[PDB]
Design a protein around this ligand. Structure first.
Ligand code: CA
Lengths: 4, 224
């Protein structure tokens, strides 16, 4: 996942 | 451990749910496109970050996207209209695009790594969203006699999600587009109603109150  | 509740932003919807979206449960929301299911997912991703007297769990969110439904600008708008800092709010939403159903399963195993890492910190993961949980399964396990294998693959995926909800005390929120078996803890049907409102109904839930909730899609995300 990656930070929005 | 005690069940935590995340407010949806709507008092009406929260009352129908018995106080908000629960931890240690999979809540499945279903309806047509624009029924409010994705607006609700975006709203919960902000609300979960609030302290409990504001309807949150002082947590962070994880969003698995299967159909390009994630809109960072919508999270920003919801945060700013609720008195929050949009950059900090977006930083507490970890996002991933699922490319297919097998990648979707691998993303759930990676989600567990992040949930474990943050479990005993000041801002643990408290919400895991899977938007259009079934879209890749319905696209891939299709055709003659595909139902049995699609249901087995979905049953396993839902069991992995139930395990994360229950083991790490998080709320798992999933959406779906409209006689099949279903294994979510709670199913909510959403539809567009009169006067621009959305109407929510609980499906197969005698354990909760009889009724329907009415809410709006606004600049604050979801509210009455
Ligand atoms: Ca929607």
């Amino acid at each position: 996942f990656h930070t929005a | 451990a005690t069940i935590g509740r995340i407010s949806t932003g709507s008092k009406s919807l929260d009352k129908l749910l018995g106080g908000g979206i629960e931890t240690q449960a999979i809540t499945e929301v279903f309806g047509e496109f624009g029924s409010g299911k994705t607006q609700l997912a975006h709203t919960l991703a902000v609300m979960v970050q609030l302290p409990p007297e504001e309807g949150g769990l002082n947590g962070s969110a994880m969003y698995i996207d299967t159909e390009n439904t994630f809109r960072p600008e919508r999270l920003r708008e919801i945060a700013q209209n609720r008195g929050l800092d949009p950059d900090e709010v977006l930083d507490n939403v970890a996002y991933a695009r699922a490319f297919n159903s097998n990648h979707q399963m691998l993303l759930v195993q990676q989600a567990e790594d992040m949930i474990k890492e943050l479990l005993n910190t000041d801002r643990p993961v408290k919400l895991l969203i899977v938007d259009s949980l079934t879209s890749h399964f319905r696209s891939e396990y299709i055709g003659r006699g595909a139902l049995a294998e699609r249901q087995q693959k979905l049953a396993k995926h839902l069991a992995d999600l139930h395990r994360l909800a229950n083991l790490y005390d998080i709320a798992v929120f999933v959406t779906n587009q409209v006689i099949l078996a279903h294994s979510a803890t709670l199913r909510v049907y959403l539809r567009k109603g009169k006067g621009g409102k959305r109407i929510a109904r609980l499906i197969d839930a005698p354990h909760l109150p009889e009724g329907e909730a009415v809410f709006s899609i606004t600049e604050k995300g979801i509210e009455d």
